[PDB]
Each structure stands twice: as structure tokens, then as C-alpha cells.
Coordinates of N, CA and C in Angstrom, one line a residue:
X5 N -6.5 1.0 -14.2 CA -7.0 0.8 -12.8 C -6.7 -0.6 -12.3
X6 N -6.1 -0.7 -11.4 CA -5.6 -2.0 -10.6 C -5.6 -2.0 -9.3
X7 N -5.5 -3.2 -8.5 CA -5.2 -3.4 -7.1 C -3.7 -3.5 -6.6
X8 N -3.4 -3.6 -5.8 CA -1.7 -3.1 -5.0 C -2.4 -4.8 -4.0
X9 N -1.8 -5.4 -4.0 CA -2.0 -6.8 -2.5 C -0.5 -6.6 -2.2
X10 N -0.7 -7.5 -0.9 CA 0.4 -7.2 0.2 C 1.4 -8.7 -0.2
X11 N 2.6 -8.3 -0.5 CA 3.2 -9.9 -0.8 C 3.3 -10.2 0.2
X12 N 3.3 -10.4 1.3 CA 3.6 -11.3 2.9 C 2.5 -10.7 3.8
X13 N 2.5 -11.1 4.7 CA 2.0 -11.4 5.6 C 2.6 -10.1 6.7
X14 N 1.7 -9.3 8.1 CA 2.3 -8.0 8.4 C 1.5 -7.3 8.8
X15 N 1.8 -6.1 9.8 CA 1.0 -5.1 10.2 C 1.3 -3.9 9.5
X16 N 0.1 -3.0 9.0 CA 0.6 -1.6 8.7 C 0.7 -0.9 9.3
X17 N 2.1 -0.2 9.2 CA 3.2 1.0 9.8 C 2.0 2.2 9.8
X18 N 2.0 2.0 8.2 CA 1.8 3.6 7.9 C 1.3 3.9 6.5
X19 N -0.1 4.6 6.2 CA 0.1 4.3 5.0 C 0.6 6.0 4.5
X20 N 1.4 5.8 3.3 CA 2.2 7.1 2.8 C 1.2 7.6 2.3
X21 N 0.2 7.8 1.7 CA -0.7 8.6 0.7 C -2.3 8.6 1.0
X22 N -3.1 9.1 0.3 CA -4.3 9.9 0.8 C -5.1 9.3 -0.6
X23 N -6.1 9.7 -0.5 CA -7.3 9.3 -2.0 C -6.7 10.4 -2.5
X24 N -6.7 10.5 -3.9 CA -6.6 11.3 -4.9 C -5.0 11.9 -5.2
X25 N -4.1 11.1 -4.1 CA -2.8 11.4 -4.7 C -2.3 10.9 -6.1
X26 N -1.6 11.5 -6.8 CA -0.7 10.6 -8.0 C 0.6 10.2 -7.7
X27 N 0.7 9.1 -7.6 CA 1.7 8.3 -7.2 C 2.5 7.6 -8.5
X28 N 3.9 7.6 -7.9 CA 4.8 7.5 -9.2 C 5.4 5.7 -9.0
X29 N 5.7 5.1 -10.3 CA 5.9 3.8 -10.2 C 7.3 3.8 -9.4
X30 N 7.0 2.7 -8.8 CA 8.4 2.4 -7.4 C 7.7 3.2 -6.2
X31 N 7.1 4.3 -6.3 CA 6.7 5.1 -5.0 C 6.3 4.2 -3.6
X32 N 6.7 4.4 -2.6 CA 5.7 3.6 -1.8 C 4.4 4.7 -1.0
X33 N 3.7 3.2 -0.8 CA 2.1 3.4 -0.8 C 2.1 3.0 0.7
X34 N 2.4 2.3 0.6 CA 2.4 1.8 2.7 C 3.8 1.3 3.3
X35 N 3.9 1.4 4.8 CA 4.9 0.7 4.9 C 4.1 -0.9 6.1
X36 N 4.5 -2.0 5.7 CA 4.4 -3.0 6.0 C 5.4 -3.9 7.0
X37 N 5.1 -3.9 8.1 CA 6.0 -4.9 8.9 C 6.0 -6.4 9.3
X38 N 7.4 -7.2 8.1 CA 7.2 -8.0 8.3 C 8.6 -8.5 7.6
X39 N 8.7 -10.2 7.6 CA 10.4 -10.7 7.6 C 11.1 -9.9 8.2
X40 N 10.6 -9.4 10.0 CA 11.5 -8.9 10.6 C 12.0 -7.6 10.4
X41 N 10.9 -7.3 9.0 CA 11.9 -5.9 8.6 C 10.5 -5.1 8.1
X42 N 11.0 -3.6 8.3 CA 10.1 -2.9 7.8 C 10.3 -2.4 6.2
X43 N 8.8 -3.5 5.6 CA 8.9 -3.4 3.9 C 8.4 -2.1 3.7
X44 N 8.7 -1.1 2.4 CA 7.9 -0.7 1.5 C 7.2 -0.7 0.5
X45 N 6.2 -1.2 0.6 CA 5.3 -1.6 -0.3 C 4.9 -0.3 -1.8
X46 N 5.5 -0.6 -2.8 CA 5.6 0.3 -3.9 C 4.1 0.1 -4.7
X47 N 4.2 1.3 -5.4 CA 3.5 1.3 -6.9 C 3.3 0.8 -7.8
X48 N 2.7 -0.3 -8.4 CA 3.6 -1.1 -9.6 C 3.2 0.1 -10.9
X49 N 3.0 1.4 -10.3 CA 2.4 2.0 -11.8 C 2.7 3.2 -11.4
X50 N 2.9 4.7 -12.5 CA 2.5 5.9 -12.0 C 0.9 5.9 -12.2
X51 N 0.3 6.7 -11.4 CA -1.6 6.7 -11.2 C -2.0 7.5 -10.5
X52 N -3.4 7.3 -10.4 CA -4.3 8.0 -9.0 C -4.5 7.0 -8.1
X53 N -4.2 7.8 -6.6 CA -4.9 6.9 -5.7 C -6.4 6.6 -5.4
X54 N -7.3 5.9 -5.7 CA -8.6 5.5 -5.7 C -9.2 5.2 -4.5
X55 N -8.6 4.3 -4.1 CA -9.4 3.8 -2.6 C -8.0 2.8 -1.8
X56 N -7.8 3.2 -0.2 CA -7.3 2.9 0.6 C -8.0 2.1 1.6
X57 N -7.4 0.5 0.9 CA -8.1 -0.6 1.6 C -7.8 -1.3 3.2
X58 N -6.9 -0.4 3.2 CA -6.4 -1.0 5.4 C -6.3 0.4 6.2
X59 N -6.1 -0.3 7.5 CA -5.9 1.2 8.0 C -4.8 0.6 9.1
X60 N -4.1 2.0 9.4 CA -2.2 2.0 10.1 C -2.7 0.9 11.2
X61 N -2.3 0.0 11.5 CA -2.4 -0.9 12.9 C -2.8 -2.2 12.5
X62 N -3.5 -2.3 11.2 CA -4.4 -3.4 11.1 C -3.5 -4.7 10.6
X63 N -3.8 -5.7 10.8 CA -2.6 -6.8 10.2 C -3.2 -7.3 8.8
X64 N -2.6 -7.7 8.2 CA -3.0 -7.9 6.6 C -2.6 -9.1 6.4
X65 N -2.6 -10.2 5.4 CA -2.7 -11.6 4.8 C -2.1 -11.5 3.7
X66 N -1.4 -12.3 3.1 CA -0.3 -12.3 2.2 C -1.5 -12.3 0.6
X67 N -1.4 -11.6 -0.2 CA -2.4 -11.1 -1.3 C -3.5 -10.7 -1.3
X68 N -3.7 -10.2 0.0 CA -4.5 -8.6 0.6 C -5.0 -7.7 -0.1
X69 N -5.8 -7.5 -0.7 CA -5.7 -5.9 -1.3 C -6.0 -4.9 -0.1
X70 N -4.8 -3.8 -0.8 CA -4.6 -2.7 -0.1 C -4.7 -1.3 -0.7
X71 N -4.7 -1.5 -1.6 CA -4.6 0.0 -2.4 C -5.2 -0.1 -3.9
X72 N -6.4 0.6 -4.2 CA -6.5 0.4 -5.2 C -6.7 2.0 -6.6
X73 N -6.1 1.9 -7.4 CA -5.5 2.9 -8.4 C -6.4 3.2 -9.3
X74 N -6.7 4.2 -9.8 CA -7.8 4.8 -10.4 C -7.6 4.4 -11.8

């Protein structure tokens, strides 16, 4: 069980997943807008999704937690 933080600085798009999905390493978990480009922010793990720490519109801070893995 770990946390997902946001490497930059950004508003969320969108987040791809729900509590209790299993998500595969590389998968993305949100998408983040920022360096002008729209990032996807991956998995560093296969897991459970636990708890979804932002919500779609909100702007986030560069080592944010955003997603945290069961």
C-alpha cells in the first residue's frame, strides 16, 4: 500500500478509476494538465484502488497525493 503524488504542478482532467478498481502498473490513474500538455499520470504498481485524493477540476501542487493503493 502506497501513495501516487503528482510530479508537477496542474489541473485534473479526469480521474480514470473508481475505489476498488485493480489497476495495472503503467495504467493511468488520472489525467493531469500541465507543461502545456496533457500528462498521464500512471501506477507505479499493479493493486487496489483505495482512496481517491482530488477531484476532476481541482488544481494540485507538485508532490500532491492523489491516489492512494490498497
Amino acid at each position: 500500500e502506497n501513495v501516487v503524488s503528482a510530479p508537477m504542478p496542474g489541473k485534473v482532467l479526469r480521474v480514470l478509476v473508481r475505489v476498488g478498481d485493480r489497476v495495472r502498473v503503467g495504467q493511468g490513474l488520472l489525467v493531469l494538465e500541465a507543461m502545456k500538455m496533457e500528462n498521464e499520470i500512471p501506477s507505479p504498481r499493479d493493486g487496489v484502488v483505495k482512496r481517491i485524493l482530488v477531484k476532476e477540476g481541482e488544481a494540485v501542487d507538485t508532490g500532491q497525493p492523489l491516489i492512494e493503493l490498497g
